[PDB]
């Protein structure tokens, strides 16, 4: 089957330019059958249309370009049909433009239409490429305690870059009841995550609980003792 392959930088600094190329194989972008364009998906969120365009060989005019209105002012999409490539350029980016970007082939009322073509559905998707937007340099985490039948306690692991961090408890001696969550990318362009463990309430006065945070990209390890609150 045909393939759409995205290429381009996976990390772009804030207010700078996000550029991607899509290389089409096994089909020709110079057909009047389809539009070519882009869709993105922020981590943990839904799909968002970016836009699509057409430029086919014909005896009439076939140049059409449609953009998502909320992106248009900083959006350029283009086709180089001889190279069988589609291009995306998004300027003035912020962390909020962090997303998996998908090359997309759109069908609909395209070849035969009334008034204007109406590409409506994507029948071929690229694998997708994750582009993270942050101006951060490598930075180790700050670690704060989430202080506590059973009780939950944890560590809030803040403001690090890039991914990933890993977390253990009591140098690995505490594994039962542990859950470490996925990170969130914050508007600062830094990540945070939490790690939690559920333990017996009766152990809080007498058992020591330390989270061990490893951030290999910054060669940082942080150990944080989590104590019961004074109230």
């Amino acid at each position: 089957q045909p393939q759409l392959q995205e290429s381009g930088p996976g990390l772009v600094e804030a207010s700078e330019t996000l550029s991607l190329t899509c290389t089409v194989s096994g089909d020709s972008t110079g057909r009047c059958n389809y539009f070519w364009g882009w869709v993105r998906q922020p981590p943990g969120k839904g799909l968002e249309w970016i836009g699509s365009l057409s430029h086919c060989r014909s005896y009439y005019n076939t140049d059409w370009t449609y953009h998502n209105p909320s992106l248009k002012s900083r959006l350029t999409i283009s086709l180089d049909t001889p190279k069988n490539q589609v291009f995306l350029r998004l300027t003035s980016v912020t962390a909020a433009d962090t997303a998996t970007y998908y090359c997309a082939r759109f069908g609909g009322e395209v070849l035969v239409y009334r008034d204007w073509p109406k590409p409506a559905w994507v029948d071929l998707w690229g694998r997708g490429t994750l582009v993270t937007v942050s101006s951060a340099s490598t930075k180790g985490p700050s670690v704060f305690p989430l202080a506590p039948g059973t009780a939950a306690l944890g560590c809030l692991v803040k403001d690090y870059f890039p991914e990933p961090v890993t977390v253990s408890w009591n140098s690995g001696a505490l594994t039962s009841g542990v859950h470490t969550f996925p990170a969130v990318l914050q508007s600062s362009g830094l990540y945070s995550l939490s790690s939690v463990v559920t333990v017996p309430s009766s152990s809080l006065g007498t058992q020591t609980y330390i989270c061990n945070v490893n951030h290999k990209p910054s060669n940082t390890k942080v150990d944080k003792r989590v104590e019961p609150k004074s109230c």
Binding site: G44, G46, L47, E48, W49, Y66, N68, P69, Y102, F106, G107, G108, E109, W116, P117, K118, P119, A120, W121, V122, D123, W125, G126, R127, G128, S142, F144, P145, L146, A147, A152, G154, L156, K158, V178, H179, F181, P182, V184, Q186, S192, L193, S194, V196, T198, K229, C231
Partner: protein, 208 residues
């Protein structure tokens, strides 16, 4: 805009239908997506199936509602389904997605623990309320935050549910505040909706 329910579920072999409201024309489509993978078109033009898509998937629509039916649910039908339509002259929009769970274990309501900002974070001039949501199934929730009795939208980040070691699901949600915001309100709440229940936990700056 297109609106979909957050979650749908059924047992293997059963039929399920998920709705998408806000549609109009016949340029309705449906996509299936697995974690960490690209969506796949399963229905286009209301009821047409691409080659290779099982006849177990069908589409219908009435007026301002479109529906995807999956008959004979199979485990690997589990995933997130997006509806989509052409709107205006030539725009494409998407629904927010429905997580379709193919039931493989008992339903379980979430346990919710809400941590106030730590003294140490407040001393660092930041404040994060941490709402930790655990031991639930199906793995889909919606999280809302309140300041006193008022909805709060800004400063909220929520992770996608993922499996715990015991194979139930957990999720996390964060409300970022300034220390002044935290101290100036009577309380803050994390409200977690799961299937037909809501569980709300509340914390206060004046209480421990």
């Amino acid at each position: 805009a297109l609106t979909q329910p957050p979650s749908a579920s059924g047992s293997p072999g059963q039929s399920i239908t998920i709705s998408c409201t806000g549609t109009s024309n016949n340029f309705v489509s449906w996509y299936q997506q697995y974690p960490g993978k690209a969506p796949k078109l399963v229905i286009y033009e209301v009821n047409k199936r691409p080659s290779g898509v099982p006849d177990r998937f069908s589409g219908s629509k009435s007026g301002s509602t479109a529906s995807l039916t999956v008959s004979g649910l199979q485990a690997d039908d589990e995933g997130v389904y997006y509806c989509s339509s052409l709107v205006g002259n030539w725009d494409v929009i998407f629904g927010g997605g429905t997580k379709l769970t193919v039931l493989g274990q008992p339903k379980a309501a979430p346990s919710v623990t809400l941590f106030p900002p730590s003294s140490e974070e407040l001393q660092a001039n930041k404040a994060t309320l941490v709402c930790l949501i655990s031991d639930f199934y199906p793995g889909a929730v919606t999280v809302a935050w309140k300041a006193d009795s008022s909805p709060v939208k800004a400063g909220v980040e929520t992770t996608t549910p993922s499996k715990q070691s015991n194979n139930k699901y957990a999720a996390s949600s964060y409300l970022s505040l300034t220390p002044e915001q935290w101290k100036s309100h009577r309380s803050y709440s994390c409200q977690v909706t799961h299937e037909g229940s809501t569980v709300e936990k509340t914390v206060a700056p004046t209480e421990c």
